[PDB]
Structures are given as C-alpha cells and as structure tokens.
Ligand binder design. Structure first.
Ligand SMILES: Nc1ncnc2c1ncn2[C@@H]1O[C@@H]2COP(=O)(O)O[C@H]2[C@H]1O
Length: 201
DNA sequence: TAAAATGTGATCTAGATCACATTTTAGGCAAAAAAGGCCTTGACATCCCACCTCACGTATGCTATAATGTGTGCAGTCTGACGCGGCG
C-alpha cells in the first residue's frame, strides 16, 4: 500500500549494535526510518554523563528536526539499543514527495505529535514527582513499550541500574536501594538483569 | 487605590560522593543430545486378481386319424397443372 510506494524509493544501510546513530551538533542532512529493531535516544552534558531521552520501536521515522529550516544541526545523540536496518532520505527530495503526496507529513504529524506529547509528560513529570514516582511510572511506561516480554503474573524486562539511573535523573545504587524497598513492598520480582512488574492490565 | 508581589534568615532534608571487592552474565561461541527429516523393519489389513464354479438358462429336436387358392375390413373419392405413354 502507501508503505510500498515509499520503500520503493529508499536507500538502506545495515547498522550494528553498540554504536552511534546521530552525532549532536553536526549537519543534519538526512531523515531515516527504523526498518527493523529498537533504538535509544539520549544526550550528553558538558561533563559527558549520559541521560536517556527515550527508547523507540518499529514504526518510526528518525532524524527529522533537521528536515525543516535551511542550516540546522543535530539536537541530540541517538545510540544503539540493538542492531538496526535503517533507511536514507534527502531533503530536496523531501520537498518533492511531500508536494506530490501529502500523506508522509500526515504520518510525521502522527509520530512527532506522539513525541512531544510523551515529552510533554516527560518534562511535566520532571518538575514534580519523587524518585518513587519517577522510576515507578518509568517502568509502567516501559511495560507499555512492546520490548518487554509477558510473565504469567505481569511483564518482564532486562536492564541494569546504570541506564535507569540515566532515565530518571539520579544515581544507580539509589534506585537499587529504593528498588529493593519496592521488592519489600511487594510490587516486583527482581533477579539481577531480569526484573518483573506485576499489576499490568 | 485594590490587589497581587516582595523581603527575615536561621533551620533543616532527600540524594550525591567516592575507591574498591565481588557477581554475573551475558552473548555468544563450542556442543550434547533430542526431535524432526531420512530411511528401515515388523506386523497387519485389505484388498486386486483372477481363478474357478455350479444352477439356471438357453439352443435345438420331434409330435404319424385327418385337415390342402387370400380377400377381410379399410379408403373416401381435394384439385389444378404438368409429363408422359398410350391412343387414334
Ligand atoms: N524530545 C525528543 N523526542 C523524540 N526525539 C527526539 C527528541 N529530541 C531529539 N530527538 C531526536 O534526536 C535527533 C537529533 O538530531 P535532530 O535534531 O536532527 O532530530 C532529532 C530527533 O530525531
């Protein structure tokens, strides 16, 4: 259907894991699409500490904020959650096929609207809640993300203390201690990498 | 000038620090073994085949008082023109 006509035009590259997608500040000259896999968008500070922006699954056009004004840059890092086949688009051609077909910026209305909605409650939560609420609702939303697997009492997922410390804006063993308290509160099971939340659905 | 904004500062309060030992656990590399894919075996079940197989059916033969030329149930006749064979 629609997607067939647009993949008919695209140029593709295969991405290994562990590496960089976007380099912040450089010339933004291409839009991409997640052909297969998952990715983690994030950003550094002056000191170099990472702080995660989000994860992203299938159904995502990628590297879009540079599409629009002449002479823009990359406003964030994007790092490998997994190995990912990824597409290629130029911007003059973006003018061409937005003009002869308006459904792609209808799609990008979809995705970008989701992204500043989810970001709207990212910052909205970033003001007020406490670390309990931060990591709690974090792992709720990751329980909504399809990367988690089904456990017969809920949802299981595999992650370390460091990266969730880079989610909620605090240190890793802090979330370790309140995590073990949360175990003692009987709302999770937890063996090392593999953690599980019940109460889903 | 009504009504919202602006200083008192001492007394606190949930997380970050910070070097180093110990887990784990990947993830991914070598693989043991089991369960399909490959074949076989024994055992069964059902036949196809045909090979027979007797009962019932069927092809054929005579019957010696004597008897000896149909018909047989119909048609109802339409009619005007054209060929042809007699017909003088
Ligand atoms: N708040 C956000 N939500 C989703 N994606 C983002 C956000 N900020 C940056 N990005 C992505 O990170 C990319 C970095 O380079 P760009 O600015 O060209 O395009 C950006 C987006 O694709």
């Amino acid at each position: 259907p629609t997607l067939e006509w647009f993949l008919s035009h695209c140029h593709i590259h295969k991405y290994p894991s562990k590496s960089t997608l976007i380099h912040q500040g450089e010339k933004a000259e291409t839009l991409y699409y997640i052909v297969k896999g998952s990715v983690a968008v994030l950003i550094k500070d002056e000191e170099g500490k990472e702080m995660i922006l989000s994860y992203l699954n299938q159904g995502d056009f990628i590297g879009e904020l540079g599409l629009f004004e002449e002479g823009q840059e990359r406003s964030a890092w994007v790092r490998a959650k997994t190995a990912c086949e990824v597409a290629e688009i130029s911007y003059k051609k973006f003018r061409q096929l937005i003009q002869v077909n308006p459904d792609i910026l209808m799609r990008l209305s979809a995705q970008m609207a989701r992204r500043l909605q989810v970001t709207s409650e990212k910052v909205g939560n970033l003001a007020f809640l406490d670390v309990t609420g931060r990591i709690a609702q974090t792992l709720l939303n990751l329980a909504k993300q399809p990367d988690a697997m089904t456990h017969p009492d809920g949802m299981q997922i595999k992650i370390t203390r460091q990266e969730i410390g880079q989610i909620v804006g605090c240190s890793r063993e802090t979330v370790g201690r309140i995590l073990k308290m949360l175990e003692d509160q009987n709302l999770i099971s937890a063996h090392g990498k593999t953690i599980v939340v019940y109460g889903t659905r």
